Amino acid sequence: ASSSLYRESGIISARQLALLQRMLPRLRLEQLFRCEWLQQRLARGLALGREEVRQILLCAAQDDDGWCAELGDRVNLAVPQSMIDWVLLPVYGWWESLLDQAIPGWRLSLVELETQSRQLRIKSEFWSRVAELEPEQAREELARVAKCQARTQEQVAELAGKLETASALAKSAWPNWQRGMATLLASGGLAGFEPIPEVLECLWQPLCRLDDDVGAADAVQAWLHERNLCQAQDHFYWQ
Amino acid sequence: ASSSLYRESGIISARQLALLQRMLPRLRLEQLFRCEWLQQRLARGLALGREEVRQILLCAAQDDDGWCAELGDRVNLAVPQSMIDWVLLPVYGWWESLLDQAIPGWRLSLVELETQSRQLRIKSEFWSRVAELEPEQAREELARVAKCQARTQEQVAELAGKLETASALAKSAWPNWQRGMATLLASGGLAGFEPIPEVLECLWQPLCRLDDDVGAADAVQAWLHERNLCQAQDHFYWQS
Amino acid sequence: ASSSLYRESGIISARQLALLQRMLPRLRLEQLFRCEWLQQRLARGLALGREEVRQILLCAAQDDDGWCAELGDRVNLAVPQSMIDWVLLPVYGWWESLLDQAIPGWRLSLVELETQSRQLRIKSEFWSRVAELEPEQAREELARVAKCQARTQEQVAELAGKLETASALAKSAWPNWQRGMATLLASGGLAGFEPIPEVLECLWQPLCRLDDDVGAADAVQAWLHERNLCQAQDHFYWQ
């Protein structure tokens, strides 16, 4: 929900943010950053190009507090990279949390912990170099932070472990997940993915008939959208 | 003003910095980092490319202490992206300042206020992870970071307030600024912007004749220059 | 040697890391992060492209404990930016430490101090923004940070000094280093270096014939590899 966040993760360049900042009033800008669409691109690390920017500017040209709802991308699933970023990765993520709903919370919890271990090593160098002067005071602080990184390390280990077991269970349920992804990055097909877990069948049928069937695009959009894996105004097609 | 500002802002890649560090003496590197040209690119978000790097190395080899003064870009105002980043946006920031000179100061103050804000969050997410092991000596940090965040929040509200008001007049003074920008972005032309404020006429006249008049380019170069919106050696031109 | 470092250094994008995290097991991924080839890209600021990620994924399939020693780049030395990033800069770094072994360590110690002063600089801005409510507490707090950015700042001066002298000696040993570089960026050849130090003769001979002798690019690769300047699987050519 913050400029810096989209900047730190490379979603928006400084150049782009400059234009956006000047064209959109603070109120629209804030709505932009909070909107489901952009938050989606953030989570998938999908940086903006000139048309994304044009479309944002275009949509905001009406004083409708719901302008963000018209935002969405036209994705060509015939491009593996697009198939991966807009479909497979999102779907696998949704699927695993289905096996165990606490998993996304673990993965996210993890990152908050490593970025937290850093602040601990950085705050260690500090009171380390500082030990020069006020040596008695630094010792004090060092003992304090020493305890923290010890616990932080342990919380990480136990989380990792749960995820190790979780991934094992998921590997058992979709063994061909890996062989499928390689076949995609070469042949471009989705067959190496079979047999796919049952729940995914309603997605996989149309997904495999994208070039043959007309209403398969709509079928895939609709399946993802119900499952909250795409936007109402996202559109998918094939080469 | 350190190389870190330029790395974080994606103005200079890691690859590029390494080459510059090897080729430029420590003293020239710092002169480069503080020079007006590179500062302009930073503010505008204009990442360096092969040529910008070469020119840096070139100009720096003269060994004159004002070598930075020879740095500039050759800019094709054909490209809508170039028209926007080198003219429209700088010019609008300048125009804006006429209507109220305190504005530029307010904007960057927000930037620093946002940073201080972010810093306080990192500082609270930090002491939250400590609150578990150090329950007692954590009730003190949260109290200061409380008022700190509150205060910070107050002034943002104020700044954002003044700027919201300024925006309103600024909109009134150039109604079709929006429309003009949409059009340029959709079709490449400048017509959507008119009528333009009278104080920008001597810039606009040449701007709309880049392709036709031969002295139209340097006429906008001169206009921007006399107002510190470009560098002495920045060269503009038109080619479609 | 963590993901976060490769992100901040702009070596791996958010979306690239998204895919690797999902495709590689926790163990397999950390192996990638600590492997020589990737540490090489990192040292030189060489961002992963589409090719590099495919390779990482193919080589991940082998499923042996040393997969990531098969990783290497294919570089076209006919491209000047490649000539610089893979040969000239690496070779110079190696050369200069022949003149004085302490130089790489100074160079690296600067970096540590530079990121450290900018850590205290940001710490100042904060406590001056917090001096709004606490003038007293923020005093001894700004006072400590001020001592640190003092010692830091002199350590830097001492190192810069030592490097200033080194610089002079290296300039005397390879006078046309700079003219060569300028020329390569201008005309794309290597004659501008031409009076090169004797210890580089064996590298220089084949480097000047990449286009003419089939075996030249291999000679170059050998020269580099025997001195740990490229990976065993790095491969060079001229197109």
XYZ file of C-alpha atoms in Angstrom:
718
model
C 0.000 0.000 0.000
C 3.068 2.242 -0.199
C 5.089 3.690 -3.061
C 8.293 2.323 -1.554
C 6.862 -1.191 -1.451
C 6.169 -1.226 -5.192
C 9.527 0.431 -5.679
C 11.505 -1.985 -3.521
C 10.067 -4.990 -5.338
C 10.503 -3.495 -8.801
C 6.833 -3.261 -9.751
C 7.108 0.465 -10.605
C 10.204 2.360 -11.727
C 11.053 5.765 -10.276
C 10.336 7.185 -13.718
C 6.872 5.609 -13.726
C 6.117 6.596 -10.154
C 7.021 10.173 -11.081
C 4.478 10.301 -13.886
C 1.828 8.516 -11.797
C 2.405 10.801 -8.846
C 1.937 13.887 -11.003
C -1.114 12.634 -12.916
C -3.091 10.998 -10.102
C -4.376 13.010 -7.115
C -3.240 11.654 -3.725
C -6.656 10.033 -3.268
C -6.580 8.100 -6.544
C -2.942 7.209 -6.031
C -3.716 5.652 -2.672
C -6.644 3.740 -4.201
C -4.294 2.503 -6.917
C -1.789 1.085 -4.433
C -4.527 -0.670 -2.429
C -6.433 -1.995 -5.430
C -6.632 -5.771 -5.886
C -5.225 -5.606 -9.406
C -1.929 -3.900 -8.571
C -1.638 -5.888 -5.349
C -1.874 -8.967 -7.554
C 0.979 -7.801 -9.752
C 2.983 -6.989 -6.631
C 2.565 -10.481 -5.175
C 3.631 -12.051 -8.490
C 6.452 -9.599 -9.116
C 4.909 -8.500 -12.428
C 6.451 -5.097 -13.224
C 4.440 -2.508 -15.171
C 5.076 -1.569 -18.803
C 3.961 1.460 -20.776
C 0.466 0.106 -21.488
C -0.191 -0.732 -17.847
C 0.658 2.855 -17.048
C -1.435 4.208 -19.919
C -4.393 2.095 -18.783
C -4.087 3.260 -15.185
C -4.045 6.893 -16.278
C -6.954 6.307 -18.662
C -9.162 4.592 -16.078
C -8.600 7.272 -13.445
C -9.889 9.932 -15.861
C -13.362 9.571 -14.327
C -14.321 10.581 -10.797
C -15.638 7.093 -9.973
C -14.300 5.754 -6.660
C -14.512 2.343 -8.312
C -12.261 3.035 -11.285
C -9.765 0.432 -10.057
C -12.285 -2.318 -10.814
C -11.878 -1.808 -14.566
C -8.179 -2.641 -14.348
C -6.939 -5.980 -15.664
C -4.514 -7.523 -18.133
C -4.841 -9.333 -21.447
C -2.746 -12.452 -21.021
C -1.647 -14.800 -23.779
C -1.435 -18.272 -22.225
C 0.413 -19.546 -25.296
C 3.472 -17.872 -23.812
C 4.945 -20.199 -21.185
C 6.164 -17.311 -19.035
C 2.630 -15.953 -18.990
C 1.126 -19.391 -18.415
C 3.423 -19.714 -15.439
C 2.975 -16.306 -13.854
C -0.755 -15.866 -14.386
C -1.919 -19.455 -14.041
C 0.374 -22.230 -12.800
C 2.162 -20.450 -9.934
C -1.080 -18.833 -8.674
C -3.000 -22.112 -8.969
C -0.375 -24.237 -7.242
C -0.327 -21.728 -4.414
C -4.087 -21.879 -4.068
C -3.995 -25.668 -4.235
C -1.377 -26.268 -1.554
C -3.189 -24.027 0.938
C -6.143 -26.264 0.193
C -4.132 -29.231 1.441
C -3.313 -27.151 4.513
C -4.670 -23.633 4.950
C -1.898 -22.560 7.340
C 0.818 -22.886 4.681
C 0.539 -19.411 3.136
C 0.722 -18.039 6.664
C 3.897 -20.025 7.258
C 5.594 -18.922 4.052
C 4.770 -15.280 4.707
C 5.676 -15.643 8.372
C 9.046 -16.916 7.178
C 9.930 -13.794 5.208
C 9.002 -11.522 8.123
C 11.536 -13.561 10.072
C 14.534 -13.390 7.755
C 14.037 -9.669 7.187
C 13.897 -9.641 10.981
C 17.130 -11.565 11.391
C 18.873 -8.972 9.240
C 17.762 -6.085 11.437
C 19.278 -8.189 14.224
C 22.681 -8.619 12.591
C 22.700 -4.966 11.562
C 21.887 -3.971 15.139
C 24.695 -6.318 16.157
C 27.419 -4.745 14.032
C 26.313 -1.461 15.572
C 26.721 -2.377 19.247
C 29.785 -4.327 18.123
C 31.653 -1.367 16.646
C 30.244 0.785 19.455
C 31.795 -1.500 22.096
C 34.859 0.677 21.485
C 33.375 3.435 23.643
C 30.828 2.681 26.367
C 31.994 -0.969 26.366
C 29.868 -1.777 29.417
C 26.771 -0.396 27.707
C 27.290 -2.322 24.460
C 27.863 -5.645 26.224
C 24.461 -4.980 27.762
C 22.739 -4.443 24.408
C 24.584 -7.301 22.718
C 23.391 -9.772 25.343
C 19.910 -8.394 24.703
C 19.910 -8.907 20.925
C 21.879 -12.144 21.220
C 18.849 -13.715 22.887
C 16.577 -12.493 20.086
C 18.461 -13.945 17.122
C 18.607 -17.237 19.023
C 14.822 -17.385 19.270
C 14.384 -15.963 15.779
C 16.633 -18.736 14.472
C 14.539 -21.347 16.266
C 11.210 -20.009 15.045
C 12.627 -20.248 11.527
C 13.828 -23.827 11.921
C 10.448 -25.076 13.136
C 8.595 -23.231 10.371
C 10.960 -24.568 7.737
C 10.344 -28.057 9.117
C 6.549 -27.822 8.867
C 6.959 -26.677 5.280
C 9.338 -29.538 4.523
C 6.709 -32.043 5.610
C 4.014 -30.031 3.852
C 5.878 -30.025 0.537
C 6.447 -33.760 0.862
C 2.715 -34.324 1.197
C 2.071 -32.073 -1.801
C 4.720 -33.845 -3.871
C 2.878 -37.085 -3.122
C -0.386 -35.607 -4.424
C 1.021 -34.095 -7.639
C 4.274 -35.997 -8.361
C 4.345 -34.880 -11.985
C 4.325 -31.192 -11.018
C 8.033 -30.970 -11.734
C 8.161 -33.060 -14.916
C 5.226 -30.985 -16.113
C 6.993 -27.660 -15.665
C 10.036 -28.788 -17.639
C 7.926 -30.057 -20.518
C 6.278 -26.634 -20.594
C 9.607 -24.773 -20.742
C 10.351 -26.778 -23.884
C 7.436 -28.428 -25.672
C 5.036 -25.769 -24.435
C 2.404 -28.334 -23.528
C 0.608 -29.088 -20.271
C 0.649 -32.884 -20.606
C 3.720 -33.519 -18.463
C 1.568 -32.227 -15.629
C -0.870 -35.147 -15.722
C -2.172 -36.653 -13.624
C -3.348 -33.417 -12.014
C -5.085 -33.477 -8.605
C -8.859 -33.923 -8.935
C -9.964 -30.478 -7.776
C -8.034 -28.910 -10.668
C -9.875 -30.813 -13.405
C -12.456 -28.054 -13.934
C -9.529 -25.761 -14.746
C -7.437 -28.211 -16.727
C -10.128 -29.172 -19.264
C -10.494 -25.716 -20.820
C -6.850 -24.914 -20.110
C -5.749 -27.654 -22.498
C -8.283 -26.694 -25.164
C -7.290 -23.058 -25.473
C -6.432 -23.212 -29.163
C -9.194 -25.620 -30.202
C -12.170 -24.312 -28.210
C -13.597 -20.782 -28.356
C -15.317 -20.659 -24.974
C -12.279 -22.088 -23.176
C -10.815 -18.631 -22.577
C -13.983 -17.630 -20.725
C -13.981 -20.955 -18.887
C -10.458 -20.436 -17.579
C -11.070 -16.776 -16.688
C -14.245 -17.772 -14.872
C -12.657 -20.633 -12.925
C -9.763 -18.491 -11.755
C -12.055 -15.589 -10.935
C -14.381 -17.677 -8.747
C -11.287 -18.906 -6.962
C -10.034 -15.339 -6.644
C -6.930 -16.045 -8.727
C -7.661 -13.362 -11.327
C -9.517 -10.080 -11.794
C -13.029 -9.602 -13.145
C -11.501 -7.659 -16.010
C -8.528 -9.935 -16.702
C -8.668 -11.592 -20.116
C -6.934 -14.727 -21.353
C -6.344 -15.983 -24.886
C -4.048 -18.149 -26.993
C -1.505 -17.050 -29.632
C 24.611 12.169 -1.846
C 26.210 8.724 -2.186
C 26.237 5.917 -4.756
C 23.641 4.220 -2.583
C 21.000 6.814 -3.514
C 21.575 6.018 -7.172
C 21.550 2.277 -6.740
C 18.354 2.306 -4.653
C 16.664 4.568 -7.207
C 17.651 2.274 -10.073
C 19.484 5.119 -11.764
C 22.737 3.155 -11.926
C 22.866 -0.651 -12.112
C 25.283 -2.727 -10.024
C 27.073 -3.658 -13.236
C 27.418 0.005 -14.241
C 28.623 1.210 -10.863
C 31.405 -1.400 -10.830
C 32.783 -0.161 -14.128
C 32.596 3.444 -13.015
C 34.317 2.627 -9.730
C 37.204 1.005 -11.572
C 37.644 3.751 -14.155
C 36.999 6.887 -12.116
C 39.306 8.035 -9.282
C 37.571 8.260 -5.896
C 37.556 12.050 -6.235
C 35.929 12.060 -9.674
C 33.314 9.581 -8.532
C 32.154 11.928 -5.783
C 32.182 14.868 -8.181
C 30.018 12.864 -10.543
C 27.617 11.945 -7.767
C 27.057 15.575 -6.810
C 26.894 17.095 -10.284
C 23.752 18.798 -11.616
C 23.318 16.529 -14.654
C 23.324 13.301 -12.696
C 21.168 14.950 -10.021
C 18.608 15.855 -12.684
C 18.512 12.283 -13.955
C 18.100 11.016 -10.389
C 15.147 13.306 -9.646
C 13.520 12.326 -12.941
C 14.182 8.600 -12.600
C 16.186 8.537 -15.828
C 18.371 5.411 -15.677
C 21.788 5.503 -17.360
C 22.474 3.517 -20.526
C 25.596 2.575 -22.462
C 26.082 6.082 -23.836
C 25.517 7.891 -20.559
C 28.207 5.694 -19.043
C 30.619 6.302 -21.932
C 30.068 10.079 -21.830
C 30.782 10.101 -18.113
C 34.096 8.321 -18.696
C 34.764 10.644 -21.614
C 34.117 13.974 -19.936
C 35.948 12.844 -16.808
C 39.170 12.232 -18.727
C 39.717 15.951 -19.371
C 40.787 16.353 -15.724
C 39.346 19.854 -15.508
C 37.516 20.154 -12.164
C 34.357 21.380 -13.863
C 34.182 18.426 -16.256
C 30.653 17.635 -15.088
C 29.552 20.815 -16.840
C 30.060 19.051 -20.181
C 27.588 16.272 -19.474
C 24.267 16.346 -21.293
C 21.877 14.210 -23.307
C 20.815 14.213 -26.931
C 17.053 14.007 -26.635
C 14.543 13.159 -29.342
C 11.323 14.971 -28.508
C 9.637 12.776 -31.079
C 9.394 9.931 -28.554
C 6.406 10.748 -26.317
C 8.287 9.272 -23.363
C 11.115 11.706 -24.023
C 8.742 14.617 -24.511
C 7.267 13.817 -21.099
C 10.334 13.216 -18.981
C 12.440 16.016 -20.382
C 9.832 18.697 -20.961
C 6.242 18.290 -19.811
C 6.957 17.014 -16.297
C 9.845 19.390 -15.488
C 7.962 22.297 -17.051
C 4.845 21.495 -15.052
C 6.788 21.324 -11.814
C 8.214 24.718 -12.663
C 4.839 26.175 -13.670
C 3.355 24.809 -10.463
C 5.982 26.750 -8.460
C 4.845 30.085 -9.878
C 1.369 29.541 -8.435
C 2.977 28.947 -5.037
C 6.714 28.666 -4.479
C 6.369 26.714 -1.233
C 4.977 23.700 -3.089
C 8.234 22.073 -4.196
C 9.342 22.153 -0.570
C 6.132 20.536 0.624
C 6.430 17.642 -1.839
C 9.904 16.507 -0.861
C 9.016 17.046 2.789
C 6.346 14.409 2.230
C 8.987 12.108 0.782
C 11.101 12.494 3.915
C 7.977 12.179 6.031
C 7.045 8.945 4.280
C 10.537 7.561 4.883
C 10.433 8.530 8.572
C 7.054 6.814 8.629
C 8.362 3.637 7.008
C 11.325 3.734 9.379
C 8.977 3.796 12.355
C 7.140 0.728 11.032
C 10.360 -1.226 10.558
C 11.144 0.038 14.051
C 7.860 -1.298 15.446
C 7.833 -4.603 13.565
C 11.263 -4.912 15.144
C 10.240 -4.324 18.758
C 7.239 -6.590 18.241
C 9.600 -9.493 17.596
C 11.421 -8.443 20.755
C 8.291 -7.863 22.846
C 8.086 -11.649 23.259
C 11.546 -12.142 24.764
C 11.893 -8.671 26.288
C 8.306 -7.981 27.406
C 9.178 -5.330 29.995
C 11.738 -3.085 28.265
C 9.551 -3.025 25.151
C 6.645 -1.062 26.608
C 8.933 1.967 26.458
C 9.807 1.897 22.753
C 6.195 1.386 21.663
C 5.215 4.498 23.613
C 7.717 6.778 21.879
C 7.128 5.211 18.478
C 3.442 5.808 19.202
C 3.700 9.591 19.481
C 6.441 9.626 16.839
C 4.160 7.908 14.346
C 1.208 10.033 15.468
C 3.130 13.295 15.073
C 4.553 12.177 11.738
C 1.002 11.303 10.738
C -0.280 14.742 11.746
C 2.139 16.691 9.584
C 1.494 14.420 6.628
C -2.188 15.317 7.005
C -1.271 19.007 6.980
C 1.165 18.855 4.065
C -1.286 16.706 2.104
C -3.842 19.380 2.970
C -1.904 22.338 1.595
C -1.061 20.321 -1.509
C -4.669 19.304 -2.056
C -5.647 22.962 -1.999
C -2.824 23.976 -4.354
C -3.782 21.170 -6.717
C -7.295 22.614 -6.991
C -6.100 26.040 -8.191
C -3.474 24.422 -10.387
C -6.224 22.370 -11.999
C -8.303 25.513 -12.505
C -5.370 27.329 -14.120
C -4.724 24.604 -16.712
C -7.949 22.595 -17.079
C -6.805 20.366 -19.967
C -3.471 19.205 -18.515
C -5.032 15.782 -17.915
C -6.666 15.476 -21.317
C -3.476 16.596 -23.015
C -1.436 13.916 -21.293
C -3.904 11.161 -22.196
C -3.871 12.221 -25.835
C -0.099 12.366 -26.126
C 0.020 8.925 -24.539
C -2.610 7.515 -26.894
C -1.832 9.254 -30.189
C 1.455 11.115 -29.786
C 0.338 14.718 -30.319
C 0.194 17.839 -28.142
C -3.252 19.165 -29.076
C -5.091 17.874 -26.011
C -3.192 20.291 -23.760
C -4.598 23.546 -25.111
C -5.498 26.055 -24.118
C -2.168 26.284 -22.267
C -1.420 28.922 -19.576
C -0.285 32.229 -21.085
C 3.001 32.139 -19.182
C 4.030 29.029 -21.121
C 3.330 30.434 -24.578
C 6.926 31.139 -25.621
C 7.744 27.539 -24.737
C 4.674 26.145 -26.483
C 5.009 28.040 -29.757
C 8.365 26.365 -30.577
C 7.302 23.074 -29.011
C 4.486 22.598 -31.526
C 6.786 23.310 -34.447
C 9.667 21.030 -33.671
C 9.262 19.242 -36.996
C 8.578 22.303 -39.122
C 10.871 25.107 -37.967
C 14.615 24.453 -37.886
C 15.331 26.739 -34.946
C 12.327 25.478 -33.001
C 14.280 22.870 -31.033
C 16.999 25.091 -29.589
C 14.282 27.638 -28.852
C 12.748 25.225 -26.366
C 16.223 24.227 -25.239
C 16.942 27.880 -24.452
C 13.613 28.324 -22.677
C 14.180 25.361 -20.375
C 17.783 26.314 -19.791
C 17.075 29.899 -18.706
C 14.882 28.329 -16.047
C 17.247 25.598 -14.959
C 15.073 22.843 -16.451
C 17.922 21.441 -18.495
C 21.702 21.435 -18.788
C 23.879 23.690 -20.882
C 24.879 20.714 -23.017
C 21.489 18.994 -23.241
C 20.614 18.932 -26.954
C 17.021 18.508 -28.123
C 15.791 17.620 -31.611
C 12.940 16.062 -33.611
C 13.016 12.967 -35.825
C 10.112 10.727 -36.851
C 24.627 -15.225 0.623
C 20.828 -15.097 0.902
C 17.994 -14.449 -1.527
C 17.557 -10.961 -0.093
C 21.109 -10.088 -1.151
C 20.532 -11.175 -4.747
C 17.314 -9.180 -4.838
C 18.825 -5.975 -3.466
C 21.815 -6.322 -5.757
C 19.359 -6.578 -8.643
C 20.670 -9.990 -9.685
C 17.276 -11.731 -9.406
C 13.825 -10.207 -9.936
C 10.825 -10.745 -7.677
C 9.143 -12.918 -10.306
C 12.295 -14.928 -11.044
C 12.711 -15.663 -7.329
C 9.040 -16.605 -7.207
C 9.588 -19.381 -9.714
C 12.844 -20.652 -8.263
C 11.389 -20.798 -4.780
C 8.557 -22.972 -6.032
C 10.606 -25.210 -8.331
C 13.615 -25.839 -6.080
C 13.442 -27.502 -2.648
C 14.663 -25.403 0.286
C 17.959 -27.300 0.370
C 18.449 -27.223 -3.402
C 17.797 -23.482 -3.466
C 20.303 -22.564 -0.779
C 22.870 -24.629 -2.667
C 22.164 -22.413 -5.659
C 22.609 -19.284 -3.597
C 26.012 -20.340 -2.314
C 27.409 -21.811 -5.527
C 30.471 -20.244 -7.181
C 28.836 -19.381 -10.498
C 26.004 -17.428 -8.942
C 28.367 -15.822 -6.416
C 30.303 -14.779 -9.528
C 27.304 -13.172 -11.201
C 26.679 -11.476 -7.867
C 30.236 -10.235 -7.444
C 30.101 -8.592 -10.863
C 26.486 -7.425 -10.875
C 25.388 -9.739 -13.667
C 21.588 -10.063 -13.581
C 19.907 -13.341 -14.483
C 18.067 -13.323 -17.796
C 15.650 -15.771 -19.372
C 18.464 -18.131 -20.409
C 20.083 -18.325 -16.992
C 16.830 -19.308 -15.333
C 16.109 -22.091 -17.841
C 19.624 -23.412 -17.330
C 19.221 -23.263 -13.554
C 16.033 -25.298 -13.966
C 17.410 -27.913 -16.383
C 20.474 -28.449 -14.206
C 18.170 -28.675 -11.203
C 16.643 -31.830 -12.682
C 19.850 -33.875 -12.352
C 19.079 -34.283 -8.652
C 22.658 -34.929 -7.510
C 24.383 -33.079 -4.675
C 26.634 -31.029 -6.973
C 24.325 -30.043 -9.830
C 25.253 -26.390 -9.645
C 28.818 -26.971 -10.789
C 27.444 -27.603 -14.268
C 26.195 -24.036 -14.311
C 28.139 -21.632 -16.492
C 27.494 -18.790 -18.901
C 28.052 -18.689 -22.639
C 29.526 -15.342 -23.476
C 30.036 -13.594 -26.781
C 33.277 -11.704 -26.431
C 32.465 -9.853 -29.642
C 30.105 -7.874 -27.438
C 32.181 -5.191 -25.692
C 30.030 -5.153 -22.564
C 30.722 -8.867 -22.278
C 34.421 -8.400 -23.003
C 34.514 -5.974 -20.085
C 32.353 -7.805 -17.559
C 33.867 -11.245 -18.107
C 37.442 -10.535 -19.024
C 38.808 -7.015 -18.584
C 37.385 -6.113 -15.167
C 37.943 -9.588 -13.687
C 41.488 -9.679 -15.108
C 42.297 -6.223 -13.729
C 41.106 -7.105 -10.251
C 43.363 -10.146 -10.343
C 46.244 -8.213 -11.827
C 46.196 -5.414 -9.289
C 46.439 -7.842 -6.376
C 49.547 -9.262 -8.001
C 51.005 -5.804 -7.389
C 49.786 -5.745 -3.778
C 47.772 -8.552 -2.212
C 46.096 -6.213 0.270
C 44.159 -4.334 -2.376
C 41.182 -6.617 -2.819
C 40.687 -6.530 0.956
C 40.850 -2.758 1.101
C 38.418 -2.452 -1.784
C 35.990 -4.722 0.087
C 36.468 -2.957 3.420
C 35.458 0.334 1.827
C 32.176 -1.216 0.724
C 31.479 -2.417 4.266
C 32.149 1.049 5.650
C 30.144 2.781 2.939
C 27.039 0.713 3.750
C 27.768 1.318 7.414
C 27.983 5.099 7.259
C 24.739 5.137 5.282
C 23.273 3.078 8.128
C 24.289 5.743 10.619
C 23.235 8.541 8.285
C 19.711 7.105 8.184
C 19.935 6.658 11.951
C 20.649 10.369 12.279
C 17.728 11.509 10.120
C 15.479 9.347 12.291
C 16.649 10.636 15.670
C 16.542 14.205 14.402
C 12.939 13.544 13.375
C 12.473 12.107 16.866
C 14.216 15.086 18.432
C 10.812 16.710 17.923
C 9.468 15.175 21.123
C 12.636 14.001 22.885
C 15.436 16.592 22.782
C 17.283 15.009 25.716
C 17.114 11.322 24.816
C 17.786 12.015 21.137
C 20.928 13.883 22.215
C 23.033 11.077 23.654
C 21.436 8.932 20.944
C 22.615 11.256 18.170
C 25.902 11.639 20.049
C 26.777 7.933 19.834
C 25.843 7.741 16.157
C 28.011 10.822 15.591
C 31.088 9.156 17.131
C 30.569 6.111 14.937
C 30.224 8.042 11.683
C 33.478 9.639 12.844
C 35.666 6.570 13.282
C 33.962 5.064 10.262
C 34.765 8.174 8.291
C 38.463 8.151 9.172
C 38.889 4.431 8.552
C 37.653 5.313 5.065
C 40.158 8.132 4.723
C 43.003 5.826 5.683
C 41.887 3.212 3.154
C 41.214 5.701 0.401
C 44.721 6.958 0.996
C 46.340 3.557 0.679
C 44.364 2.989 -2.520
C 45.388 6.381 -3.854
C 49.011 5.266 -3.721
C 48.241 1.836 -5.177
C 46.369 3.495 -8.039
C 49.469 5.515 -8.898
C 51.687 2.421 -9.002
C 49.209 0.458 -11.157
C 48.953 3.401 -13.545
C 52.726 3.302 -13.906
C 52.610 -0.459 -14.548
C 49.812 -0.345 -17.144
C 49.861 3.188 -18.516
C 47.295 2.631 -21.296
C 44.650 0.852 -19.202
C 42.405 3.879 -19.432
C 43.018 4.763 -23.067
C 42.421 1.119 -23.929
C 39.103 1.115 -22.095
C 37.975 4.359 -23.715
C 38.925 2.931 -27.090
C 37.047 -0.317 -26.511
C 33.923 1.691 -25.649
C 34.474 3.846 -28.712
C 35.756 1.654 -31.523
C 35.250 -1.749 -29.919
C 38.809 -3.055 -30.276
C 41.620 -3.754 -27.787
C 44.634 -2.055 -29.397
C 44.219 0.937 -27.074
C 45.570 -1.180 -24.218
C 48.304 -2.426 -26.484
C 51.420 -1.951 -24.375
C 50.091 -4.505 -21.857
C 51.836 -5.873 -18.743
C 53.997 -8.918 -19.437
C 52.035 -11.277 -17.161
C 49.020 -10.913 -19.462
C 50.835 -11.806 -22.643
C 49.523 -15.389 -22.654
C 45.952 -14.125 -22.306
C 46.406 -11.213 -24.698
C 47.729 -13.214 -27.633
C 44.563 -15.332 -28.079
C 42.229 -12.537 -26.957
C 43.340 -10.544 -29.982
C 42.472 -13.421 -32.306
C 39.034 -14.530 -31.139
C 37.670 -13.970 -34.637
C 40.544 -15.648 -36.502
C 41.542 -18.788 -34.613
C 38.955 -21.386 -33.686
C 40.883 -22.313 -30.559
C 41.415 -18.755 -29.341
C 38.264 -18.522 -27.245
C 39.213 -21.798 -25.579
C 42.718 -20.518 -24.864
C 41.154 -17.487 -23.246
C 38.768 -19.633 -21.182
C 41.682 -21.837 -20.120
C 43.808 -18.823 -19.120
C 40.935 -17.497 -17.009
C 39.999 -20.812 -15.476
C 43.572 -21.689 -14.461
C 43.522 -18.498 -12.418
C 40.009 -18.955 -11.052
C 38.676 -16.060 -13.119
C 35.790 -17.996 -14.683
C 33.882 -21.208 -13.958
C 34.901 -24.563 -15.387
C 31.613 -24.519 -17.298
C 31.926 -20.956 -18.528
C 32.288 -20.979 -22.316
C 33.407 -18.150 -24.622
C 33.080 -17.369 -28.328
C 33.007 -14.613 -30.960
C 29.899 -13.672 -32.974
